[PDB]
Design a protein around this motif. Sequence first.
Motif, mmCIF file in Angstrom:
data_model
loop_
_atom_site.group_PDB
_atom_site.id
_atom_site.type_symbol
_atom_site.label_atom_id
_atom_site.label_comp_id
_atom_site.label_asym_id
_atom_site.label_seq_id
_atom_site.Cartn_x
_atom_site.Cartn_y
_atom_site.Cartn_z
ATOM 1 N N UNK A 289 -46.238 -122.766 -45.603
ATOM 2 C CA UNK A 289 -45.768 -121.933 -44.988
ATOM 3 C C UNK A 289 -46.499 -121.309 -43.701
ATOM 4 N N UNK A 290 -47.736 -121.382 -43.773
ATOM 5 C CA UNK A 290 -48.410 -120.772 -42.517
ATOM 6 C C UNK A 290 -48.302 -121.922 -41.225
ATOM 7 N N UNK B 105 -44.781 -121.425 -40.045
ATOM 8 C CA UNK B 105 -44.782 -120.425 -39.062
ATOM 9 C C UNK B 105 -45.632 -120.485 -37.833
ATOM 10 N N UNK B 106 -46.574 -121.667 -37.741
ATOM 11 C CA UNK B 106 -47.218 -121.564 -36.226
ATOM 12 C C UNK B 106 -46.004 -121.839 -35.223
ATOM 13 N N UNK C 218 -42.679 -120.697 -34.625
ATOM 14 C CA UNK C 218 -42.266 -119.485 -34.095
ATOM 15 C C UNK C 218 -43.332 -118.311 -33.596
ATOM 16 N N UNK C 219 -44.486 -118.613 -33.866
ATOM 17 C CA UNK C 219 -45.831 -117.734 -33.403
ATOM 18 C C UNK C 219 -45.949 -118.374 -32.103
ATOM 19 N N UNK D 254 -41.048 -129.474 -34.560
ATOM 20 C CA UNK D 254 -42.444 -129.375 -35.513
ATOM 21 C C UNK D 254 -43.389 -130.343 -35.279
#
Lengths: 202, 151, 166, 184
Positions: free
Chosen positions: A15-16, A19-20, A22-23, A164
């Motif tokens: 999950x990290x 979310x890279x 939308x970071x 992604x």
Amino acid sequence: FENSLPKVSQSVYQMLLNEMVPLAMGIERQISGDIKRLKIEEHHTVDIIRSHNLIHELYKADEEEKEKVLARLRNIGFQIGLKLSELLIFSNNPNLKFKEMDLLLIMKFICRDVWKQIFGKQIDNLKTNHRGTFYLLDYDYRPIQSFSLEEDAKNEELKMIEPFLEIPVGIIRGVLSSLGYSSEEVICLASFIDRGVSFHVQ
Amino acid sequence: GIYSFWIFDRHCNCIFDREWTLASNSASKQNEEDAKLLYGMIFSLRSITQKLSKGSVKNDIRSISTGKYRVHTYCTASGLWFVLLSDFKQQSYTQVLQYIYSHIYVKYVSNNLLSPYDFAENENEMRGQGTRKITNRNFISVLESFLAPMV
Amino acid sequence: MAIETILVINKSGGLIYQRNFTNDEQKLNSNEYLILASTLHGVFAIASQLTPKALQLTQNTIPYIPYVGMDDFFKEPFTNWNKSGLRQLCTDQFTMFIYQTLTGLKFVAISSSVMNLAIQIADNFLRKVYCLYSDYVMKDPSYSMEMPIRSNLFDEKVKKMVENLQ
Amino acid sequence: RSLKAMGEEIWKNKTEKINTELFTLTYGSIVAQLCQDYERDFNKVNDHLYSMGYNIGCRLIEDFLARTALPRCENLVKTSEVLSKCAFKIFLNITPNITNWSHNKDTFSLILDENPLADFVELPMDAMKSLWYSNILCGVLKGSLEMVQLDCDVWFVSDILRGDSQTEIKVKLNRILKDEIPIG
């Protein structure tokens, strides 16, 4: 052979990893060069967006700004790929020396070890055109199993999945440029045959 | 027996509803019939459960039996409710509902970044009657893959 | 099965009778039992209101007789007056058995026993306490209609029934 | 049965992978991104790290509650119990310690022993006095606790990387959220 050295959970990393993206969209759309939310800190305020609205802002993104985003994703994949390859060096694989004259011998390294380390499994198939163009295949790319497509709107869902893919583009670009140079390398789709994504390199 | 299946919210909106006997799975003639009054029933009997509680740990409601039907329920600690209706042929379904929470809702909604986590899109009308979307390609497919072998 | 707190509500209002007896402790009883009795009165109507799509019939709605109590009060299986209404509630710490009567009057037994046949022995026991309510409150001339129970005799008629159950 | 036993117990049915050579350099690479994109700003990076932390904590609380089914916490005894004895146990294989509460017990501190987010980093001289490193953890401990109906605020005090004092996080109850029941 069975090394039981310290470990953490797979889920928080996956999950990290998710979310890279939308970071990167948040770091580009907010560069601080002069609907959202607001939070309370001690004599301090931040103002955020949530992730799925930012992926929808990628759906309404400018075209040149879209490729300005995608350089950052391959840059961060490039950094983690070269550092992760540098840690693989400790493994002492006997295949390669330097500059990769036999290119498929280190294609037999990346599918065996690197994809095993990041995604828990081998790359299931690799096809070889002998001009340097090598045809990757995997049936289930691991961090998009949790991405649920919506009801009967898959033409949007393809366009919201495939940004992604620039992170493993960065992974294989970084492990190639840890071994010396930069050559061309792109993505594919390759709709799977039995119940995910393909890659080209030079 | 699984005649119906409903999902409620921290901000108390019906966000997903399934009706048995090949009935509608969408969230629109079935909307607001039994949705607010079922929340009133579960909230009321939960409130008198939480009012009459002894011990260190507060208790939560498990099942409500009528003559016609039986209701099984399950709460989170975040405030999301799994309810289901049966016809007395089987014993309690808290294993099934916790399997739904541990294997379908987290796998295809919560850790799914691509749909939002349960919330109201920054509405001041988050007190009620906010229709929402927990519809997906695969969530309903694996949910009917699990639920339909029992009838 | 085992019954630990008794509640008798009105047919159309707040409750008439409440005893937290055989729990050797002090719990609060003042003015929240009226609120919870009124919410049971509401949600019986709410729980009757929603219909799952059955659309069949009683093919049923009749128990038997386990010889509960202690010459019992009845020697045959009997019938029931709440076909589509709330029958029990089941939580972690207690199960609440409810039984209403055909005039509209309901009887509530909060039971601290945890987790089919329980419905049978509950309906038998609450029909027996309906019998003692008819035989010892409705016969009283001092008892006005729809007022709190003031009979001292009804107390040791039901304490002995509960301590005969266990 | 105990919260030690459950948190150790989930490590028999949890999928796992290496804590060095992945997951340290993910956080290191994104903080390198935030350092190089703001032209070495040292306080805006804390804000963007705390934002991404809030988002991942609000998305992580559901997986924590579905992994072990637990009742909603109410004080800073059960949260100080559940955090240090299963949450960092099943997400980071570590266990912190609890000290320095107030007289009303409305705070505590969160002394951490082996932070696996910063293993052999040694931050440079300019960032040593005006940057916090592990702000993804403070974001998680805001966003996770804000969805179990508690407003909260979680802040670093010191850490090993710049200072002799240990890695600890201060935290205030900041009231209990009221669940909104009626229609209007």
